[PDB]
Write an enzyme that holds these catalytic residues in place. Structure first.
Site, short mmCIF file in Angstrom:
data_model
loop_
_atom_site.label_atom_id
_atom_site.label_comp_id
_atom_site.label_asym_id
_atom_site.label_seq_id
_atom_site.Cartn_x
_atom_site.Cartn_y
_atom_site.Cartn_z
N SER A 91 14.34 -20.75 -79.89
CA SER A 91 14.89 -20.79 -78.55
C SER A 91 16.36 -20.40 -78.58
O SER A 91 17.09 -20.71 -79.52
CB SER A 91 14.70 -22.21 -78.02
N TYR B 216 16.35 -31.56 -77.60
CA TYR B 216 15.37 -30.49 -77.68
C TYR B 216 15.92 -29.36 -78.54
O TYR B 216 15.27 -28.85 -79.45
CB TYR B 216 15.04 -29.94 -76.29
N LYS C 17 14.89 -27.57 -82.43
CA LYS C 17 14.69 -26.17 -82.75
C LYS C 17 15.67 -25.74 -83.83
O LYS C 17 15.30 -24.96 -84.70
CB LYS C 17 14.81 -25.30 -81.49
N1 NAD Z 1 9.29 -21.75 -71.93
C1 NAD Z 1 10.50 -21.46 -72.41
O1 NAD Z 1 11.43 -21.10 -71.68
C2 NAD Z 1 10.77 -21.53 -73.88
C3 NAD Z 1 11.97 -21.00 -74.35
C4 NAD Z 1 12.24 -21.01 -75.70
C5 NAD Z 1 11.34 -21.59 -76.59
N2 NAD Z 1 10.15 -22.10 -76.14
C6 NAD Z 1 9.19 -22.68 -77.10
O2 NAD Z 1 8.00 -21.90 -77.03
C7 NAD Z 1 6.86 -22.73 -77.29
C8 NAD Z 1 5.84 -22.54 -76.20
O3 NAD Z 1 6.38 -23.01 -74.95
P1 NAD Z 1 5.54 -22.94 -73.57
O4 NAD Z 1 6.49 -22.45 -72.52
O5 NAD Z 1 4.21 -22.32 -73.78
O6 NAD Z 1 5.29 -24.48 -73.34
P2 NAD Z 1 3.90 -25.17 -73.05
O7 NAD Z 1 4.28 -26.60 -72.80
O8 NAD Z 1 3.12 -24.43 -72.03
O9 NAD Z 1 3.24 -24.92 -74.49
C9 NAD Z 1 3.31 -25.85 -75.62
C10 NAD Z 1 1.94 -26.35 -75.96
O10 NAD Z 1 2.04 -27.23 -77.10
C11 NAD Z 1 1.10 -28.28 -76.94
N3 NAD Z 1 1.51 -29.37 -77.81
C12 NAD Z 1 2.66 -30.11 -77.73
N4 NAD Z 1 2.78 -30.99 -78.68
C13 NAD Z 1 1.67 -30.79 -79.47
C14 NAD Z 1 1.25 -31.40 -80.66
N5 NAD Z 1 1.93 -32.36 -81.27
N6 NAD Z 1 0.08 -30.97 -81.20
C15 NAD Z 1 -0.59 -29.99 -80.58
N7 NAD Z 1 -0.27 -29.34 -79.47
C16 NAD Z 1 0.88 -29.79 -78.96
C17 NAD Z 1 1.08 -28.57 -75.44
O11 NAD Z 1 -0.11 -29.25 -75.05
C18 NAD Z 1 1.18 -27.15 -74.87
O12 NAD Z 1 -0.12 -26.61 -74.65
C19 NAD Z 1 7.42 -24.14 -77.49
O13 NAD Z 1 7.69 -24.39 -78.86
C20 NAD Z 1 8.76 -24.11 -76.76
O14 NAD Z 1 9.68 -25.07 -77.24
C21 NAD Z 1 9.84 -22.06 -74.79
#
Ligand code: NAD
Ligand code: NAD
Ligand code: UDP
Ligand code: UDP
Lengths: 335, 339
Positions: free
Chosen positions: B128, B152, B156
């Site tokens: 991120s 958070y 990361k």
């Molecule tokens: N959306 C953003 O702006 C953004 C930006 C930078 C980084 N990220 C990272 O990208 C990744 C995906 O984000 P997203 O937007 O799809 O979020 P999201 O919440 O839609 O996807 C994350 C998924 O992880 C699952 N999950 C969480 N903890 C878990 C665990 N312990 N075991 C199994 N599954 C688990 C959740 O059920 C969910 O389906 C994450 O790591 C997030 O931190 C997202």
């Protein structure tokens, strides 16, 4: 009344003695990765009258259920969190093991503590969170950066504790940055007994002294120090123990760091020569390269601790070496 | 003949990535705990993927459930892992930091350990822009200083450091660390898209939910930043561009040891700008509550794109307009997300 994680080990054993001798109750949890129950038996005996206020269990902090069981039977005004792996060199080879044991274990602990409403924590941090400090001595306000996984686990955990504090002000947290504890109880009845091959300097030297190890390998001879070898702040473990009772008084402040050191820097060769002096034995040396992850010079500014906790290190190197030798002499194979 | 384990695959970014993997010939197993998603996403990906849907399985599995994870690894050989699983709200992290360190770091370490255990040492990690902290550099480059300002962000930064230490201990590992900026949009079919459980924490899924009647207003977190309009600036990228960046990453993995790539567009857009583009796309009014800053929010953050263009041969192709278009397409037919 206290919960002492890692209490069978080096610093926690000594600290449990002091807790008992201060009229504290103490429950120990330890998984005996680098200690045994024999250390706590002895501490029970040596504490005399007050030995019936110590109780102890073989528990891993990563085993949430078994740890919850502990917190359900007894209540604790505080937790002293000693448990974890502590070898810079090992951690570089085995980073996952370090992050596993230290972070997962700590996080499990912190969560169980919240759940049962014990939010006073004294944490074993480490001078390793100063990395290679550009400036020495090392103040509590100087930059924190680490140079190896072990250091990282301690820096991250400190950072986690800060965030928990910020999230909830019921928490009272003291981060004790120990430098390099050495020595033993002056009786020689208890002391350092690491299991598996030793990693720390002085317990390796004590084993060389009684023939359990053939040589001390010196990690680095080309450092910018008086003699080319690493410099550290060695502090008698009995002083460090008394620093915990001080920290407990202090809790009754939110999230505070305190160095625990002497304020003097001693080289490896100096410590060897001080040991030879106290023991009358000769410690064969192998000069090798630097250990990956090692700082060059690291010693404490002790002033915050001196003033805030009203605590000083009393014992000098000769006291550290005499007590250590007294333990090793009378217990060459440990507990 | 290439097989991928996708953690968090039922989630927003994983969902869309999984579909591109299926479309690009890959096979895939998803593990997810449904903390922030439902299995509907992946049902629909199977349909949307056509016959390539037949190369997808998914399983309800928490990454911190080691026996369950080991089961997964013993039933399938994996050429690589894309680690999406985690909690992702800056503001939630400040309120609930243990939840974050627990889920993110216990999660990650357990998976890292199982991966090593089964000899699968090829990782693509969801990092991120929040590792750039409140930055002095804009644009934010892969060589620029890293520092978080909230739990958070720390998970990361810490996990990146963990991956560096694993790489150092063990030269078999191949790790690409992807710093996503602010993914938005949905599959152009409009048949899948973002659907968080409970209250959304990210901007545009909250906005979508206001547009369709499900939330009463957007709370804009700060109108006193030092920006055109006083609201936060961010680099918003089409989730499908983001998805494609993972196919590119998976390719680079066969070259490289522990390597960081930004995935963004390199333009900075304000909160009010994104609001305005969404009203233009949807034709709906978004009521706004102007409130104070969200603990741990950066002021201005947007990407350098040079390294990724050069080394992944990847560049965003979609603009804000497409992003809002596809978002509204998803939302209008699916106003309450999946059934
Ligand atoms: N959306 C953003 O702006 C953004 C930006 C930078 C980084 N990220 C990272 O990208 C990744 C995906 O984000 P997203 O937007 O799809 O979020 P999201 O919440 O839609 O996807 C994350 C998924 O992880 C699952 N999950 C969480 N903890 C878990 C665990 N312990 N075991 C199994 N599954 C688990 C959740 O059920 C969910 O389906 C994450 O790591 C997030 O931190 C997202
Ligand atoms: N010894 C030093 O020079 C030094 C310096 C700075 C900081 N520290 C820190 O101080 C603490 C105490 O160190 P020590 O010198 O007493 O070493 P030690 O190894 O003797 O003490 C650690 C104890 O924790 C136990 N333990 C380890 N993992 C555990 C787990 N998952 N669950 C339960 N128990 C577990 C071990 O069995 C051991 O008894 C450690 O956290 C260490 O990192 C030590
Ligand atoms: O077998 C050993 C262990 C330690 N040391 C040195 O002794 C100092 C203290 O080492 P220890 O591992 O006890 O403590 P650290 O400072 O790493 O926590 C450092 O300069 C190490 O390089 C050494 O030369 N040989
Ligand atoms: O309900 C919300 C959610 C987000 N934002 C702002 O929109 C931008 C994007 O935030 P989001 O949480 O989607 O992503 P982040 O950049 O924090 O990962 C930031 O400036 C936030 O302050 C906002 O004003 N209100």
């Amino acid at each position: 009344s206290v919960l002492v994680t890692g209490g069978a080990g080096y610093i926690g054993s000594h600290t449990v003695l002091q807790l008992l001798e201060g009229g504290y109750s103490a429950v120990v949890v330890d998984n005996y990765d680098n200690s045994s129950a024999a250390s706590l038996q002895r501490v029970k005996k040596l504490a005399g009258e007050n030995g019936n206020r110590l109780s102890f269990h073989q528990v891993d902090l990563r085993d949430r259920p078994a740890l919850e069981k502990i917190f359900s039977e007894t209540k604790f005004d505080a937790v002293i969190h000693f448990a974890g792996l502590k070898a810079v060199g090992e951690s570089v080879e085995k980073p996952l093991l370090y992050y596993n044991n230290n972070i997962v274990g700590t996080v499990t602990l912190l969560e169980v503590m919240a759940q049962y409403g014990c939010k006073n924590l004294v944490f074993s941090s480490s001078a390793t969170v100063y990395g290679w400090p550009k400036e020495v001595p090392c103040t509590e306000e100087s930059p924190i950066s680490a140079t190896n996984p072990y250091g990282r686990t301690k820096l991250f955990i400190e950072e986690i504790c800060r965030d928990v504090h910020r999230s909830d002000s019921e928490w009272k947290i003291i981060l004790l940055r120990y430098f390099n504890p050495v020595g033993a109880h002056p009786s020689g009845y208890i002391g350092e007994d690491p299991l598996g091959v030793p990693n720390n300097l002085m317990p390796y030297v004590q084993q060389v002294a009684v023939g359990r190890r053939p040589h001390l390998t010196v990690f680095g001879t080309d450092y910018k120090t008086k003699d080319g070898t690493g410099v550290r702040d060695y502090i008698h473990v009995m002083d460090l123990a008394d620093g915990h009772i001080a920290a407990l008084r202090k809790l009754d402040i939110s999230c505070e760091v305190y160095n625990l050191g002497t304020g003097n820097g001693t080289s490896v060769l100096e410590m060897v020569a001080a040991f030879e002096k106290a023991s009358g034995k000769k410690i064969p040396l192998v000069m090798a390269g630097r250990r990956p992850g090692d700082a060059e010079v690291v010693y404490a500014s002790t002033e915050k601790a001196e003033r805030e906790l009203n605590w000083k290190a009393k014992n000098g190197i000769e006291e550290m070496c005499r007590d250590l030798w007294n333990w090793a002499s009378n217990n060459p194979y440990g507990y």
